[PDB]
């Protein structure tokens, strides 16, 4: 292992001696690749060599040559970003000239193509990294320079097309970009002219591909005169559309042309459409099934189709009106529409959203034209716009129904082998797919609910029959109905919906096994959830449904019950008014029936699934008034868990936030005991520390948790209450002795402050200020104004904020203001902006009164200005400073 030392000592000396040798450099970079230890040691050596300085790199390139090319290019590229601002502009521009020269040299060589242009690519990247920082205020002529230098050779020009592409990659706002266009237009016209030359004169395919690429990218910015006033359109139509080599890069261009807003040019757009169709019908046959061809379609073959959709969407969205207008064009537009409908059948994530993007718009427009549905047979005046697309609308309804995605609501998914199970690989992409299809289908359903009804009914009969019955085949349909929620009118919606429900129940009756039952239950649940307006119309129907839910929460197959609880909440939320009352069909209230059958239902559910259930029931019972009756019902509701408390609290506060304000009937009977025992626990803790780090003990935390959960409960009820009159006079007074004195009696080591901050918004807090801002103020700043305690900082400032804003001894006030100013000096946002608001309302309070209008000016006003002065970066002028300070428009003046 002696040679290792020699090799190690060899490399270190050559770097600091300013004399570089090529062969020795070559040996090492190969050694690292072909050795184990060599890799690590030589890499460390490489960062060590890179740290020094560049000077050797360029002359290393000047004089193996490809690996060290990657190396030296790493050197240069890295040193550039670092010292581009440090170095003088002329020297770095010298390095730039060196880069340009190297580029021209190596691109002008034929062997570069045999070198496969990796070195060319990296070199280009260097040029990019330089150009990125240089361009704005160093090279105003760069454009014209490359344009000029591309007029001699092929390799040069095409490599400069690559450069222009990369420049388009390294070049926010509408207006500023429009100023960009107007400022750069003069320099753009040349860039268009070059490509204009190459497209008409060249023979080289690899050059032309890059040319149409870069012209595609730059098209958006190049002036309109060079586009529609020339033969560029016709040129792209006849010459570069037919040829396969360009078939998928040409289309894009045309798409980009369609996206231009018609101003002075109208006809040329019609010509564009007519000719694009004329050539597309030849390129692709009308009879051809797009889906199958796309399936067997190669990597290149797909881009043509995706671009077909992209083009058709992009053009129609802008000028479909212009095409409609003429009578001749009407047929061609029908044909093109047929094409798009065909392309809309490709089973792929991207293309679907691409053509859907059209479908949406289409439905939208002719819906905003005529909101009313066409016919109901159970006389002209047909909407003009509708008339045109008329025999092509029903196809979209037939299509949209059968193809929509899984809702965010349901949790049922089939695996490729055919297994049913819930899964949540959930990205908002598919969800937005869902919602967009939903909106579209509603737009289309508003055009004729009759056709929609028939379309769904037919497939439903085919499903009851069993013909072509697969879980997916029903899933799609049910999801489709669940998106029609509120499309048809009441009297029709009933008549249509009842059939769907009955046949659905029958379909659940026929199907056997858990594999079917899970799917059917899922579909039926979602399809029920979306129709509260129907269920509130018919009582016994709703009864049947909710009973089917309760019966479905007895299911063993995972995912189903968890969904059924969600559906239950979704029904409770909107049908809260139909549950309590005694209905015409049933003598006993449904809630009353539930409260005694709950024990058998909730045994199969998960605990988390039970909490939601309790919240739902609470939302049901919280709807009734009827004076004492609902209170009695609440008593019955909570009588089971609450009874064992007198002779856990988490579920209690769950029910508290769930039911709402009318929690007083249960809150009151257990209220005083809480204070009575809390008064003892507080003394337990305080005496525990007084005779001893006890806060670290488990028992003390366990005793303080009670103290917290007691306060948070009052926080909840008061936050959700609507009777300040009762709160302020009844529940508020029993806090002075039990809570306020507790903070004083308890040790600093052992949520009390942040809780009382809320009631200020609700209630009457002024008369308690001397009691509140006493024990928990001056003796607490010793814990929070010393620098510490991330919890307390999100509490006190809020209380001070509310108290200072809602209703406006000195020793207790100074320390307040000093705290306000202390707020925006932090690094935490929630402890900073608070003081901004508090101070903003502070100066806006004492300035509106009569008595203390000058006591805040002379004593504090000029003494506060000095503090805010350091955090920045009308009272003196109005006679309610210019020397003391020096010794929207106002914001821009200070920031500048």
Curated annotation (Swiss-Prot):
Residue numbers bearing the Phosphotyrosine modification: 434
Region described as Interaction with HIV-1 Rev: spans on this chain: 752-770
Cellular compartment(s): Cytoplasm; Nucleus, Nucleoplasm; Nucleus, Cajal body; Nucleus, Nucleolus
Residues the record lists as N6-acetyllysine modifications: 426, 650
HEAT repeat placement: 203-226, 227-263, 340-452, 495-533, 540-577, 582-619, 730-763, 827-858
Annotated keywords: Acetylation, Cytoplasm, Host-virus interaction, mRNA transport, Nucleus, Phosphoprotein, Protein transport, Repeat, RNA-binding, Transport
Consequence of substituting residue 552 to A: Does not abolish Ran binding activity and partially abolish nuclear export complex formation
Phenotype upon changing residue 177 to A: Does not abolish Rex-mediated mRNA export
InterPro entries (UniProt xref): ARM-like (IPR011989), ARM-type_fold (IPR016024), CRM1_repeat (IPR041123), Exp1_repeat_2 (IPR041235), Exportin-1/Importin-b-like (IPR013598), Importin-beta_N (IPR001494), XPO1/5 (IPR045065), XPO1_C_dom (IPR014877)
Result for mutant: residue 530 to A: Enhances Ran binding activity and does not abolish nuclear export complex formation
GO molecular function: DNA-binding transcription factor binding; nuclear export signal receptor activity; protein domain specific binding; RNA binding; small GTPase binding
Sequence similarity: Belongs to the exportin family.
Free-text function comment from the UniProt entry: Mediates the nuclear export of cellular proteins (cargos) bearing a leucine-rich nuclear export signal (NES) and of RNAs. In the nucleus, in association with RANBP3, binds cooperatively to the NES on its target protein and to the GTPase RAN in its active GTP-bound form (Ran-GTP). Docking of this complex to the nuclear pore complex (NPC) is mediated through binding to nucleoporins.
Subunit structure: Found in a U snRNA export complex with PHAX/RNUXA, NCBP1/CBP80, NCBP2/CBP20, RAN, XPO1 and m7G-capped RNA. Component of a nuclear export receptor complex composed of KPNB1, RAN, SNUPN and XPO1. Found in a trimeric export complex with SNUPN, RAN and XPO1. Found in a nuclear export complex with RANBP3 and RAN. Found in a 60S ribosomal subunit export complex with NMD3, RAN, XPO1. Interacts with DDX3X, NMD3, NUP42, NUP88, NUP214, RANBP3 and TERT. Interacts with NEMF (via its N-terminus). Interacts with the monomeric form of BIRC5/survivin deacetylated at 'Lys-129'.
UniProt-recorded name of the protein: Exportin-1
Organism: Homo sapiens (Human)
């Amino acid at each position: 292992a002696i040679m290792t030392m020699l090799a190690d000592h060899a490399a270190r000396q050559l770097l600091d001696f300013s004399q570089k040798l090529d062969i020795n450099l070559l040996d090492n970079v190969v050694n690292c690749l072909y050795h184990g230890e060599g890799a690590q040691q030589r890499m460390a050596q490489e960062v060590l060599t890179h740290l020094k300085e560049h000077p050797d790199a360029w002359t290393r390139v000047d004089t193996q040559n490809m690996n060290t090319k990657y190396y030296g290019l790493q050197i240069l590229e890295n040193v550039i970003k670092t010292r581009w601002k440090i170095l003088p502009r002329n020297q770095c521009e010298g390095i730039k000239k060196y880069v340009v020269g190297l580029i021209i040299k190596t691109s002008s060589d034929p062997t570069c193509v045999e070198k496969e242009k990796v070195y060319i690519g990296k070199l280009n990247m260097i040029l990019v990294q330089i150009l990125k920082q240089e361009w704005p205020k160093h090279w105003p002529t760069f454009i014209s320079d490359i344009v000029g230098a591309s007029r001699t050779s092929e390799s040069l020009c095409q490599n400069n097309m690559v450069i222009l592409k990369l420049l388009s990659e390294e070049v926010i706002t509408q207006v500023k970009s429009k100023h960009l266009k107007d400022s750069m237009c003069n320099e753009f016209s040349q860039i268009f002219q070059l490509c204009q030359f190459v497209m008409e004169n060249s023979q080289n395919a690899p050059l032309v591909h890059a040319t149409l690429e870069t012209l595609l990218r730059f098209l958006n910015w190049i002036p309109l005169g060079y586009i529609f006033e020339t033969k560029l359109i016709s040129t792209l139509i006849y010459k570069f559309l037919n040829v396969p080599m360009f078939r998928n890069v040409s289309l894009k261009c045309l798409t980009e042309i369609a996206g231009v807003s018609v101003s002075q040019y109208e006809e040329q757009f019609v010509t564009l459409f007519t000719l694009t169709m004329m050539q597309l019908k030849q390129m692709l046959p009308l009879n051809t099934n797009i889906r199958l061809a796309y399936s067997n379609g190669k990597d290149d073959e797909q881009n043509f189709i995706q671009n077909l959709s992209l083009f058709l969407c992009t053009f129609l969205k802008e000028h479909d009106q212009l095409i409609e207008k003429r009578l001749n064009l009407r047929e061609t537009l029908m044909e093109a529409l047929h094409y798009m409908l065909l392309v809309s059948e490709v089973e792929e994530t991207e293309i679907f959203k691409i053509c859907l993007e059209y479908w949406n718009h289409l439905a939208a427009e002719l819906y905003r034209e005529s909101p009313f549905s066409t016919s109901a047979s159970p006389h002209f005046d047909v909407p003009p716009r509708r008339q045109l697309y008329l025999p092509m609308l029903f196809k979209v309804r037939l299509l949209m129904v059968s193809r929509m995605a899984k809702p965010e609501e349901v949790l049922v998914v089939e695996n490729d082998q055919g297994e049913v199970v819930r899964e949540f690989m959930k990205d908002t992409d598919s969800i937005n797919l869902y919602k967009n299809m939903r909106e579209t289908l509603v737009y289309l359903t508003h055009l004729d609910y009759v056709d929609t009804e028939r379309i769904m009914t037919e497939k439903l009969h085919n499903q009851v029959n069993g013909t072509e019955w697969s879980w997916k085949n029903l899933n799609t349909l049910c999801w489709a109905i669940g998106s029609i929620s509120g499309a048809m009118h009441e009297e029709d919606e009933k008549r249509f919906l009842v059939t769907v429900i009955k046949d659905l129940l029958g379909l659940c009756e026929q199907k056997r096994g858990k594999d079917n039952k899970a799917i059917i239950a899922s579909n039926i649940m979602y399809i029920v959830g979306q129709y509260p307006r129907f269920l509130r119309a018919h009582w016994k129907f709703l009864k049947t449904v909710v009973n089917k839910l309760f019966e479905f929460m007895h299911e063993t197959h995972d995912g189903v019950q968890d969904m059924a609880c969600d559906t239950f909440i979704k029904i409770a939320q909107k049908c809260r008014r139909h549950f309590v009352q005694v209905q015409v069909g049933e003598v006993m209230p449904f809630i009353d029936e539930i409260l005694n059958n709950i024990n058998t239902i909730i045994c199969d559910l998960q605990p988390q699934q039970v909490h939601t259930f309790y919240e739902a029931v609470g939302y049901m019972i919280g709807a009734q008034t009827d004076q004492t009756v609902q209170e009695h019902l609440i008593e019955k509701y909570m009588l089971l868990p609450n009874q064992v408390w007198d002779s856990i609290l988490k579920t209690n506060v769950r029910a508290c936030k769930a039911v709402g304000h009318p929690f007083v009937i249960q809150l009151g009977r257990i209220y005083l005991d809480m204070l009575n025992v809390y008064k003892c626990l507080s003394e337990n803790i305080s005496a525990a520390i007084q005779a001893n780090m006890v806060t670290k003990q488990p028992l003390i935390r366990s005793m303080r948790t009670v103290k917290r959960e007691t306060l948070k409960l009052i926080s909840g009820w008061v936050s959700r209450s609507n009777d300040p009159q009762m709160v302020a006079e009844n529940f508020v007074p029993p806090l002075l002795d039990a809570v306020l004195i507790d903070y004083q009696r308890n040790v600093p080591a052992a949520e009390v402050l942040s809780t009382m901050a809320i009631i200020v918004n609700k209630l009457h807090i002024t008369a308690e200020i001397p009691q509140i801002f006493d024990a928990v103020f001056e003796c607490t700043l010793n814990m929070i104004n010393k620098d510490e305690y991330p919890e307390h900082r999100t509490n006190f400032f809020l209380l001070l904020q509310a108290v200072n804003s809602h209703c406006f001894p000195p020793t207790q006030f100074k320390l307040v203001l000093d705290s306000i100013i202390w707020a925006f000096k932090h690094t935490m946002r929630n402890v900073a902006d608070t003081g901004l608001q508090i101070l903003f309302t502070l100066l806006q309070n004492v300035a509106q009164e009569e008595a203390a209008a000058q006591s805040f000016y002379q004593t504090y006003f000029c003494d506060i200005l000095q503090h805010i002065f350091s955090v920045v970066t009308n009272l003196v002028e109005e006679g309610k400073l210019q020397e003391y300070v020096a010794n929207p428009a106002f914001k821009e003046h200070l920031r500048d």
